[PDB]
């Protein structure tokens, strides 16, 4: 099964990669680096966890912006490769308002903007933060969606040549791979 988007209507006439840049830089950066990870406050958090989830959520520590990653995660936490992200990444939500988590059966978005399904990503451990999963999550948590944009260029060129992250929204509409938000 190939990329599905969802967006809003706002976002009809923005590319993907504006889009993106637009959402990293609001969304920020959480500072999720050694020695800087020392409370909750920016660890993000996993469904069901403790260190593995077929959901990963953080909220920006900068703005109202979360992200939801959705798949089958892991993270070593200081196994080695120590501190690397990996498993199965299938989707990314963006928007306002993270809710929910593990103990209410699973993280959402009161806000959503823009998500992207059957991203078909998997790495395995042994790449440690080489791993695609990898750079494409630690990208968002920092203020870098070049990863992200990287991966969903590539799926929409294999899906027709003429898509690519440059394509609006509404372009990856009329060709079957994106859908706005309902009326009303």
């Given amino acids: 099964m190939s990329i599905s988007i969802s967006y809003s209507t706002t976002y009809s006439g923005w590319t993907v990669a504006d889009y993106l840049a637009d959402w990293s830089a609001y969304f920020g950066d959480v500072n999720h680096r ?20 077929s959901q990963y ?3 920006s520590t900068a703005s109202d912006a979360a992200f939801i990653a959705g798949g089958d995660l892991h993270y070593t936490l200081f196994s080695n ?3 690397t992200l990996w498993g199965k990444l299938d989707s990314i939500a963006l928007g306002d308002t993270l809710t929910g988590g593990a ?21 395995p451990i042994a790449q440690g933060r080489d791993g695609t999963v ?21 799926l929409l060129k294999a899906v027709d040549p003429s898509l690519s992250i440059n394509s609006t929204f509404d372009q990856l509409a009329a060709a079957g791979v994106a859908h706005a938000t309902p009326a009303a």
Avoid: C, R, W
């Avoid at 050694?34 to 069901?48: E, I, R």
């Avoid at 103990?103 to 790495?123: H, I, K, M, T």
């Avoid at 494409?136 to 944009?149: I, K, N, P």
């Fill in 34 to 53: 050694p020695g800087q990870v020392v409370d909750g406050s920016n660890t993000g958090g996993f469904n069901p966890g403790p260190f593995d989830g």
């Fill in 134 to 154: 990898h750079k494409v999550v630690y990208g968002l948590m920092s203020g870098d969606s070049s990863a992200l944009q990287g991966q969903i260029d590539a």
């Fill in 57 to 59: 959520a953080l909220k």
């Fill in 103 to 123: 103990s209410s059966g699973g993280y959402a978005l009161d806000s959503q903007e823009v998500s992207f399904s059957n991203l078909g990503l998997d790495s």
């Fill in 81 to 83: 490769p120590s501190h």
